[PDB]
Amino acid sequence: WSSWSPCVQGKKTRSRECNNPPPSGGGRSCVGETTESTQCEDEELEHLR
Amino acid sequence: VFSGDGKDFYRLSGNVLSYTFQVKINNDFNYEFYNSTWSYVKHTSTEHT
Amino acid sequence: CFCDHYAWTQWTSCSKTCNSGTQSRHRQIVVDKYYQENFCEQICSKQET
């Protein structure tokens, strides 16, 4: 993963793009999702305290 | 529980949600074989008087 | 015929990369007096799929 982008509207993002030697010779595409987005950590900081 | 396999009684903890004593055995075999053989002969002669 | 005379080619890149796909190979058939006389055209499979 490219390290998580700073938060917008309570969510991060991150991207991985199969940048190792690509699916080749008719081989199947990389098994997974290119991008993820996840909710931010601010609820720990506010709530558990 | 009485185990129907190894033929014995056993004690279970409250940490285990279920200890069942079902049996399953699943087998898959693949056997694949090749053999080959050849022989060949050539002769020539060229002659005069 | 000794059909094992002819080429152990690699299998072709998988036609559909990840679903119900197929691959094939062929003997690299070169015709000769041997091939014509020893029933090779009759008994040998030219391509495997």
Domain spans, chain C = 3-49
Phi, psi of C44 (to 5 degrees): -80, 130
For residue C45, the one-letter residue type is: S
> Residues of C with CB below 8 A from A25's CB?
13
CB-based contact, C19 to chain A, within 8 Å = no
Whether C8 has its CB under 8 Å from any CB of chain B: the answer is no
* Count of CB atoms situated within 10 Å of the CB of A1: 9
List the one residue out of C32, C46, C35 whose CA is nearest residue C1. Answer: C35
- With CA atoms as reference, report the closest residue to A27 among B12, C14, C26: C14
SS3 A19: coil
Residues of chain B in Cβ contact (below 8 Å) with chain C: 36, 38
Contact A27 C15 (CB under 8 A): no
Solved using? cryo-EM
Cα–Cα distance measured from residue B41 to residue C46, given in angstroms and rounded to the nearest whole number: 25
CATH number attached to the domain at C3-49: 2.20.100.10
Q: Which chains touch A (3 or more CB pairs under 8 A)?
A: C
Resolution (A): 3.5
Nearest C-alpha neighbor of A39 from the set A15, A13, A16 = A13
In chain C, what residues touch B38 (CB-CB under 8 Å)?
Answer: 2, 4-5
